[PDB]
Scaffold this active site. Structure first.
Site, PDB file in Angstrom:
ATOM      1  N   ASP A 187     105.881  37.841  70.560  1.00  0.00           N
ATOM      2  CA  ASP A 187     105.855  37.379  69.081  1.00  0.00           C
ATOM      3  C   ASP A 187     107.305  36.863  69.219  1.00  0.00           C
ATOM      4  O   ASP A 187     107.573  36.708  69.156  1.00  0.00           O
ATOM      5  CB  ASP A 187     105.744  38.721  68.340  1.00  0.00           C
ATOM      6  N   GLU A 236      96.189  40.906  71.710  1.00  0.00           N
ATOM      7  CA  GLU A 236      95.166  40.925  70.623  1.00  0.00           C
ATOM      8  C   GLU A 236      94.596  39.962  70.870  1.00  0.00           C
ATOM      9  O   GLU A 236      94.236  39.534  69.283  1.00  0.00           O
ATOM     10  CB  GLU A 236      96.225  40.635  69.524  1.00  0.00           C
ATOM     11  N   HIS A 290     102.588  33.234  67.921  1.00  0.00           N
ATOM     12  CA  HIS A 290     102.477  34.165  69.150  1.00  0.00           C
ATOM     13  C   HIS A 290     102.882  32.785  70.016  1.00  0.00           C
ATOM     14  O   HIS A 290     103.217  31.392  69.513  1.00  0.00           O
ATOM     15  CB  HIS A 290     100.767  34.251  69.935  1.00  0.00           C
TER      16      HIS A 290
HETATM   17 MN   LIG Z   1     101.651  40.373  67.979  1.00  0.00          MN
END
Ligand SMILES: [Mn+2]
Ligand SMILES: [Mn+2]
Ligand SMILES: [Mn+2]
Ligand SMILES: [Mn+2]
Ligand SMILES: [Mn+2]
Ligand SMILES: [Mn+2]
Lengths: 589, 589, 589
Positions: free
Chosen positions: B365, B341, B531
């Site tokens: 995460d 991401e 994160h």
């Molecule tokens: Mn994520």
């Protein structure tokens, strides 16, 4: 009182008796009690706070009680004309806050509100402190824990402690203003503290910075610019009272008999010249040296010494030793705060302690941390008692006030006393416990004599150090503790492998189990410089109060938090973490 | 040594042996001892600190001992000429402070003063540190707790730990300078950490910021701008080693057999292209793509992915999984730190851990906090042992280094090792413990394959996260702890109701009963982003040292206070509250 | 090239040829022209910019054209290894801004964009400058006013002027980094500029601060720590070339014949010692003084002198005169920038001018402003020509480079030339025009010899002064103008009532009719210190560029605004009021 060494008069303490301005009965009924409070404080301070020469501090009380701005202005005027440098407000009733405040930003100030019920005295204390905090004028608040009956002139013990601590700290701060720091020489062997930061002296201490190259000593020695009659008396006194110890220089480095005699003559002349530079000497005027006779009005000074001077001339050990002592060939006297290696920051560290105690201060190197493991390996001895968790070797590069021997005695205990309390026996013993050793020529090519003694153990002391850090400015660290005694043979072993011709003080800092005081190692690991100043007694609380007046944060200290006494404004920056609040207050205020 | 992937050579560590400038005695008697001290440090570092490719760090020693400014200047010159990026000063004696200092403000520096008695080595240490603090040049101080005899070539354990921690942190900091962070795509689903703040990279890390729109991948895939020979080998390797797990997509969301085949082909091409973008590929030159062959000299990069790319093309799970792993179709190799991401802040969090350990880092995460009550309610099982007070589910959105399986083994324990220590069995086991699952099309419309594994329990780990906060700048949080095992039936239940096609790590942070570590809930409640980065081992102390060199405050960590190692200047900002002092020092320095 | 006096090599200039990264035709067609630009600039600089020893500056060109970050990193790496201290980017086309930028914050940088039409070269210049401005990395922009045809390698005159001005200023800045300022002695008679502010040297100039007490001279003189063979040659040279003028001391203050001879011997030894301290002397090592042989690597130094040294020893007039001259008993040579009264700020003022011109600089007191009215009253003469509106008497307290006589000649005009251009006649005439006068004992009790000469008129010069102001920091003032000739009898009258034994320079500043240059009186009334530095030529524009690189604002100058050349970022802080923009830029950047 006239300052005996410096220009002007000694700072006075002004007492401001505030009162409710309302007549028709209120004020009329309170003037006597209010003035009585002022008189009680004056009496207390005069019996507990003394100038460096032993004279009791002098107080000035306002001509009238202060119930409004007109009377507040009158007090300010009288105090300015009387030479007041510290102010204390006292009251047993409600007074009109801002109308009665001391608005002088340049004077340390405190407020004592009587803890009585008949009149809102505590209400005034809290009200006016809110005013000082709102206006940015730091002021100390003094509130007794126990309710006293109206008219009681007895000052409670908790109130007395705060009044005296504030007064001593305030007086010390007032004492430095207008005085000079005299730099003799330049930076010494890249020592940070020997770099002079004028902004610090000017803006934090209100002091002046004076400079003189060491070549001045060459001129005065060569042309005989010093009291020759005193010189002869001094040399004779030295030969009679200063015992010369063994020469540790090995043949190839040993100086001749002729050189050693010259080393003494020059060492003595250096002492005279340094003192003459600090406070002047009328004798020089009579000799035709009127400018030199003036002096540099220095309450503290330093001598570079290494490397330039010592590579050719006798070192400054004797000069630095004798000036800082409480006596010499002219008898007992106040010390002349003098820094080795022109370390002006250690000079100021010493000055803080001196002005708060009137006692000689010990300049020292934080030389070695000796762990129990190390002592056991090297000597086979297990450290005991206060020394059980390790010790720190404090020992300057050859110079230390003779007071450092710890031979002065009070109630059968080792101490360092103000010169005006010394007995002939105290002085005699300090000298007997000291040996003057020919300087190590590998370090001091020009010779000289180092001070060799061993501080008696069991004496409460406080070491401190002022540092200047980029992005922060001045910052003070403190470590209260005790000197300790090691078995003779144990000391001898640790001493011989270090520097036996220099002065030793074995120090153990009080531990707290937290911060930089979790263990003895941590105290040294957290020391911010190679030098420190040692003062007799536990003066950490006094130093903390003094530091707050100067807006110098204290990055490290082992003073019980219940003893921390700072301006009321500090609490507004935090009550949970006093250290953080201290940094925040010093920066913003 | 030449950096095998990036422009230039790997940073070297310079050793500065300082000495007393006095000759005809002192200096001559210390020359050998001082140089031997420097050589001892070099040997120690060469045996304990390694570059990311497994080569021992290389040290440069000054040509002569440093007793003054001329020799200091010569050392500075030699160090600049030989590519020194970290410096360590060593000495057993007194040296002239500022005259011998390393004045380069751009390199991490430490000073080790021998704890000996014969010479003032600790005096030099404290003296020069006072200089570094006064001048605003942060420097670490290393002082051993036990006195050592003169010439002792053995470095004590406490000194060794500080030298190595400093060296590793300094090398990591030096490694980032001049390198790029490559942003592939833009912001991903409004994630704050995917916004690039150039000032941070430029001013804190000395890094460059490069950008490339994801459409670049379309062009390279369509025009075959990648090594086709390698592509074929990679595809074969994937078919033989990457096991495909059950498809959880129900009818309507299930992709066809043809689509799934193309998903693999594109997924592999994506991995090649991403790597080629980061470090270039000489093969592209003969293919007529010289500009593309250069690469962006990126030591770290990120791929936006959602929503634009994944709404049509196979996701970046495989690419993100393989690049971060310590091996692929070309054999074992150093990972390519790559952020899911395009979370550049998590990318840097990963880079910090990587440069300090040379081990693959796990992107994850911080998905769910499972309290003992919740686990009991949902599974009827009572958490035991380390997990007794709750657990945290760490699981990235489909990608994680295969090293995350925890299948690599050392001494019968689960670990993540630097690629150069991997055995063929370690690698085979990592692959066998992993299943590749068809991506959930409800989230990833274009298909792809997510990484499904379960990290073995009992492994010490450290999670960390760098955040950028308005009014503060960068700030780092750390949480050391362990991975844990749950009974298979328990894991299955918790896993099935979360995201069973993604990689799972069950984490338990070490608690302190204070700060944000009072309980497991508090650790997650205080995490500043969605994160985190996971590294094998307890590297919190290393991270703290690295953060201080970078002037990045640590807002949260569970590292024992005794292990905190920061520049000496930090103590000047506070010794009671290290956290507050950290913020104060980072801002002012 | 190796620096002949200081550690390391002389700074080099790096040329960065940037190009469009696109292949398929664009880049291929531009590599030759782009490299040709780089070569043209290198040639221009090598023919116009020279190191202080006369060697042409050396340039380093990147190994490839720079079309992206990889090549930019490669250039940075090569420049770092080659010792580049100044960078210039050149291009005839569009390039990718941030991808091709020089990101080194510690190197002065400029960008020259070809003013051609075929490719967006000016677009790159403006684009990259926007990048430098946005990232806070000051960079100079160079754009030629007239469109040139593609491939034209001829550099336009306006472009040449900017490239050379930038190069000289950049080189001067690079030259100071890593060098020391040696303070010999301390503060001289309370002169502000003799207080050393380390933060300035460290943070603005990248210089080190070294200190040595004047007692060092006593030691070296007494122990013969200097080249005795050179000493004998020097004394002989002095007796043969330095003419002794009349003694103005009146009988009661006259020194004996024996003293005067000793004054010469010590004055010569002082010169040798000062030089040996600044750059070392291998001869001292051979004599058994290895530490002293090293020197303090000082590119500039100062000598306190008054009052301490001069109250007993011969003054520093001869030493300060000869060191700053371009020749002595060893022949022609580069000057040794040496400050009278240890005024380090005047020393730096002199250093700036020296590094920009390679010519000896004149230390002077801004002694008297002589209005036309005053000259008429005192002499009956009406000032004419350039002097018609008044003159300023520049005359140091007895010391000045012999170059100050103005006897050196070029094209029949008076000048000061770099030592490597001096003819034997130039040197001979400088000596013939000088008289050495026994020092005024009322001021200099230890004797010595002052330099008495009169600077020839009609010579263009620039006086400057660096000051450090609280709340601002360093600030530079400049005044370009000319020296003037007064009728012999007129000079004699003004001279005799001032200090006829000191060196005179009659100065007239260029007036602008505004600011501090409305009239001659205003120039002196606005001078911020009692001293200034005089350089031959009109170097105001060069000083302004140098000041902007150092982020030192210029509070006063009479340089035509069209000649002001500062980093592009300055314009972002204001285009209407350049002075205000200068203060704003220096503070923020
Ligand atoms: Mn994520
Ligand atoms: Mn010392
Ligand atoms: Mn002893
Ligand atoms: Mn699974
Ligand atoms: Mn002057
Ligand atoms: Mn003349």
């Amino acid at each position: 009182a006239k300052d005996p060494r410096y220009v002007g008069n000694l700072p006075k303490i002004g007492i401001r008796p505030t009162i409710d301005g309302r007549r028709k009965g209120v004020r009329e009924s309170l003037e006597e009690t209010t003035m009585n409070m002022a008189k009680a404080v004056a009496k207390l301070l005069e019996e507990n706070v003394f100038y460096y020469n032993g004279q009791p501090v002098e107080c000035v009380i306002a001509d009238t009680c202060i119930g409004g701005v007109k009377e507040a202005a009158e007090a300010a005027e009288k105090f300015a004309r009387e030479g007041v440098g510290v102010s204390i407000t006292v009251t047993p009733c409600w007074c009109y806050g801002t109308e009665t405040m001391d608005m002088d930003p340049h004077i340390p100030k405190a407020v004592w509100g009587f803890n009585g019920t008949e009149r809102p005295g505590a209400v005034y204390l809290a009200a006016v402190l809110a005013g000082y905090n709102q206006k940015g004028l730091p002021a100390f608040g003094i509130y007794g824990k126990d309710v006293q009956d109206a008219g009681d002139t007895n000052i409670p013990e908790d109130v007395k402690e705060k009044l005296i601590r504030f007064a001593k700290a305030g007086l010390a701060v007032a004492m430095m203003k207008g005085k000079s720091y005299l730099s003799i020489g330049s930076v010494s062997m890249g020592i940070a503290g020997s770099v002079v930061q004028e902004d610090f002296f000017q803006n934090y201490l209100g002091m002046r910075n004076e400079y003189v190259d060491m070549s001045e000593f060459v001129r005065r020695i060569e042309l005989g610019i010093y009291d020759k009659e005193e010189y002869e008396r001094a040399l004779k006194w030295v030969k009679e009272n200063c015992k010369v110890g063994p020469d540790n220089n090995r043949d190839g480095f040993k100086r001749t008999e002729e050189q050693k005699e010259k080393d003494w003559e020059i060492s003595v002349k250096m002492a005279l010249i340094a003192r003459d530079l600090m406070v002047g000497n009328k004798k020089l005027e009579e000799m035709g040296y009127g400018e030199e006779a003036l002096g540099r009005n220095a309450i503290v000074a330093g001598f570079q010494g290494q490397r330039q001077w010592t590579d050719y001339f006798p070192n400054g050990d004797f000069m630095e030793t004798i000036l800082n002592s409480s006596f010499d060939w002219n008898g007992k006297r106040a010390p002349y705060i003098f820094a080795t290696e022109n370390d002006n920051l250690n000079g100021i560290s010493m000055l803080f302690g001196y002005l708060l105690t009137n006692t000689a201060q010990i300049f020292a190197d934080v030389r070695t941390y000796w762990s129990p493991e190390a002592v056991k390996r090297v000597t086979g001895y297990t450290l005991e008692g206060r020394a059980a968790n390790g010790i720190i070797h404090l020992i300057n590069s050859g110079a230390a006030a003779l007071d450092g021997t710890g031979e002065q005695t009070k109630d059968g205990k080792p101490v360092i006393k103000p010169y005006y309390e010394l007995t002939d026996e105290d002085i005699k013993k300090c000298l007997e416990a000291t040996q003057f050793r020919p300087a190590s020529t590998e370090y001091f090519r020009g010779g000289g004599y180092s001070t060799d003694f061993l501080t008696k153990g069991g004496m409460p002391v406080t070491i401190s150090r002022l540092n200047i850090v980029k992005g922060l400015g001045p910052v003070l660290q403190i470590a209260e503790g005790y000197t300790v005694d090691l078995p003779e043979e144990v000391h001898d072993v640790l001493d011989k492998r270090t520097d036996p011709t220099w002065p030793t003080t074995w120090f153990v800092p009080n531990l707290t189990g937290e911060g930089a005081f979790k263990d003895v190692y941590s105290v040294m690991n957290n020391w911010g410089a190679n030098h420190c100043s040692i003062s007799y007694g536990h003066i950490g609380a006094d130093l903390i109060t003094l530091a707050s007046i100067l807006r110098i944060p204290v990055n490290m200290h082992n003073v019980p938090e219940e003893k921390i006494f700072r301006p009321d404004a500090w609490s507004m920056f935090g009550t949970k973490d006093l250290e953080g609040a201290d940094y925040r207050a010093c920066k913003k205020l």
